[PDB]
Nucleic acid binder design. Structure first.
Ligand SMILES: Nc1ncnc2c1ncn2[C@@H]1O[C@H](COP(=O)(O)CP(=O)(O)OP(=O)(O)O)[C@@H](O)[C@H]1O
Lengths: 49, 56
DNA sequence: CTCAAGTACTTTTTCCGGTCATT
RNA sequence: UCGACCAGGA
DNA sequence: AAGTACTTGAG
């Protein structure tokens, strides 16, 4: 069915940026611990909390 | 306080040495020893002490 | 022996890859 | 497996 | 930057 409204439609230069989800997504439920503090480590890189 | 903090205890005579869990040794293989900063300073106090005692 | 000015000290939002030296 | 700089995200 | 917390110094 025709949309009641008419849409502003056309080409537009769009950019792909370097922030892709699967490079951010992280979950840690117990893992590596810091030596000194005995607390979780830092960053997804180190699989921290 | 007569029991917990006498004025005389503000001056140090006997130094308490914290154990390794406080000042951990950073081992970066077998041969690569690596000690903490607090371990170096205590060794330096102990170095400085040994000199003062020998002079006396 | 009062009070103006110089002296020093201690803070400064929250979470979230690379490269260097050296441990 | 240690922490400093730099560059970034909302 | 703006308090504090003192010395330092003039009248
Ligand atoms: N330096 C910072 N510190 C803390 N929070 C920040 C921040 N920068 C951004 N944010 C968070 O992000 C929120 C708004 O920033 P943005 O989302 O990047 C703007 P926007 O909402 O996308 O569009 P707008 O510019 O039309 O408002 C803030 O309310 C805050 O919660």
């Amino acid at each position: 069915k025709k949309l009641m409204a008419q849409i502003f439609f056309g080409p537009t230069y769009y950019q792909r940026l370097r922030h892709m989800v699967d490079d951010k997504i992280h979950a840690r439920a117990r893992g590596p611990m810091q030596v000194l503090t005995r607390q979780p480590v830092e960053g997804r890189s180190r699989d921290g909390g | 306080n007569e029991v917990f903090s006498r004025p005389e205890w503000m001056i140090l005579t006997c130094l308490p040495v914290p154990p390794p869990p406080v000042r951990p040794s950073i081992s970066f293989n077998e041969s690569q020893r690596g000690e903490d900063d607090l371990t170096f300073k205590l060794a330096d106090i102990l170095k400085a002490n040994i000199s003062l005692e020998t002079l006396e």
